[PDB]
Ligand binder design. Structure first.
Ligand code: BEF
Ligand code: BEF
Ligand SMILES: [Mg+2]
Ligand SMILES: [Mg+2]
Lengths: 120, 121
């Protein structure tokens, strides 16, 4: 199946994304820390990762920088941080796309499709 | 020879981009109509296109639908149409990214970089 990993500390976000994604026909995995995010990324072979930056054990930008040393999987940042400067940093570190919260599930899922067509 | 095509009808935006994109050492080519745009895409062989949507000779979403039949060049739309369905439409048409005006140039440049790195692969 099309595998998606969500790295987000807040269940309400993770339930909401899963539902929408499982509704669109994707298998979904989860992680609620940065550290557990990296392990799941290396074990579940996700085709796409949705990343949150405000995580309790570190900033997700360190996740993107770790990840990109060993993986080229698409990464969409979904975060409360809305500064232009936050977006620039995360894209340059290696994220592929960035949506601030609050967001529209519709826009997400479409950007999800963009990221899944180009790399695969 | 990293080549950007800007297809945008208001001049001020076009030279705002050129000032920005020429500053990182790229080559920039302008088009003010959808027709002269589609054309430049097929001809100048650019590495990316920044695509306006509100054009005099038709809708940018048709620029994409058409393009995707003969080019795979990354497309980033830059348009004032700030609507969710507008974004979904353009993306589903084969746009790679979408930034609404008004916009920060820094973020447009970082998103341009994503499209270069992902398509050189
Ligand atoms: F905590 Be995440 F960056 F919204
Ligand atoms: F005219 Be563009 F869509 F801003
Ligand atoms: Mg968080
Ligand atoms: Mg216009």
């Amino acid at each position: 199946m099309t595998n998606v990993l969500i790295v987000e500390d807040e269940q309400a976000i993770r339930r909401f994304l899963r539902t929408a994604l499982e509704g669109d026909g994707m298998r979904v995995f989860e992680a609620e820390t940065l550290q557990r995010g990296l392990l799941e990324a290396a074990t579940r072979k996700p085709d796409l990762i949705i990343l949150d930056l405000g995580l309790p054990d570190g900033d997700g930008i360190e996740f993107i920088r770790d990840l990109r040393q060993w993986s080229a999987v698409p990464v969409i940042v979904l975060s409360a941080r809305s500064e232009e400067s936050d977006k620039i940093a995360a894209l340059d570190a290696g994220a592929d796309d960035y949506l601030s919260k609050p967001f529209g599930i519709g826009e997400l899922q479409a950007r999800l499709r963009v990221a899944l067509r180009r790399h695969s």
